[PDB]
Design a protein around this ligand. Structure first.
Ligand SMILES: [Cl-]
Length: 259
C-alpha cells in the first residue's frame, strides 16, 4: 500500500506516466504500477534483438564471429561505436556489445537485419512466451514514442517476465545466457537510471532507452548484497513532444520499490 502511494506521488510530481514492474526472486513476488499498460521501449528493445542473435548462435557456432560491413549508409542518429568502424567490419559479438553497452543504434539495426527484421525479433519474443512485446520499426524511427501509438511497445509486466527468462531463466543456453548477463553488467549508459536508486554495493546489468516525448526507460537484473536477484523495469514518458530526459524518475522509482 505504501509503495503504491509513493509511486503514485512520484508519478504525479513528475508530470508524466510511469510504469514499474519488480520481480523479487526471493519470494516470487511482484510490485506493479501501470504494469499492463503499453510504453514505447526505445533502446530497451536491444535486449530482445541481442537475445535473438544469441539464440540463433546456439545452432550456428561461427555466428558471433561473423563479420558485418559498416558503411556511411548505415549511420543513423546515434552511432558512438559504429562511427569508428566505417569502411571496415564488426563481428556480431562486437555489434551486440555495442548495442547493449553503448546503445549504438547502427549495431541495433545490424542485429535486427541479421535475424530477419522487426517481425522476426517479435516472432522470437512470441516463441519465448511473450505475447505483448512488439518491435515494429528499425532505428531511428522506433523511438518516436507518440502517446497512444502501439508501435514498438511492451508492458512493464511482460518485459520484466521476459528479462527474468533471458537473464535468470532458460530462454538461452548456458553460454549464451552468461554472455547476455556479462554484456548487460558492462553497460555504460545506466549509472543515472535504476543504478542511481540502489545502494552502491549492488550489482546491476541494465539496458536504458530514450526517445520522443521525454521517454526515459531502464530494464535491469539486480543482485543485491547477499540476496536473491531482482528484475526491475521502469518506463517513463511525458506529455510534451520535446520534453527532456528524466533519468532521476527511474532512480526514484527503483529506490521506492527496493527500500
Ligand atoms: Cl514540446
Amino acid at each position: 500500500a505504501d509503495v503504491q502511494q509513493k509511486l503514485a506521488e512520484l508519478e504525479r510530481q513528475s508530470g508524466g506516466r510511469l510504469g514499474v514492474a519488480l520481480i523479487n526472486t526471493a519470494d516470487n513476488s511482484q510490485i506493479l504500477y501501470r504494469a499492463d499498460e503499453r510504453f514505447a521501449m526505445c533502446x530497451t528493445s536491444k535486449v530482445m534483438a541481442a537475445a535473438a542473435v544469441l539464440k540463433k548462435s546456439e545452432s550456428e557456432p561461427n555466428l558471433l564471429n561473423q563479420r558485418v560491413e559498416i558503411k556511411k549508409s548505415d549511420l543513423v542518429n546515434y552511432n558512438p561505436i559504429a562511427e569508428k568502424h566505417v569502411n571496415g567490419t564488426m563481428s556480431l559479438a562486437e555489434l551486440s556489445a555495442a548495442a547493449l553497452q553503448y546503445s549504438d543504434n547502427v549495431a541495433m539495426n545490424k542485429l535486427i537485419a541479421h535475424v530477419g527484421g522487426p517481425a522476426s525479433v517479435t516472432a522470437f519474443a512470441r516463441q519465448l512466451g511473450d505475447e505483448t512485446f512488439r518491435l515494429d520499426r528499425t532505428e531511428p524511427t522506433l523511438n518516436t514514442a507518440i502517446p497512444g501509438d502501439p508501435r514498438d511497445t511492451t508492458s512493464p509486466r511482460a518485459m520484466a517476465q521476459t528479462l527474468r527468462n533471458l537473464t535468470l531463466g532458460k530462454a538461452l543456453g548456458d553460454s549464451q545466457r552468461a554472455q547476455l548477463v556479462t554484456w548487460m553488467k558492462g553497460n555504460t549508459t545506466g549509472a543515472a537510471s535504476i543504478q542511481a536508486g540502489l545502494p552502491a554495493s549492488w550489482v546491476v546489468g541494465d539496458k536504458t532507452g530514450s526517445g520522443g516525448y521525454g521517454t526515459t526507460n531502464d530494464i535491469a537484473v539486480i543482485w543485491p548484497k547477499d540476496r536473491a536477484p531482482l528484475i526491475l523495469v521502469t518506463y517513463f514518458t511525458q506529455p510534451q513532444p520535446k520534453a527532456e530526459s528524466r533519468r532521476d524518475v527511474l532512480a526514484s522509482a527503483a529506490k521506492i520499490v527496493t527500500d
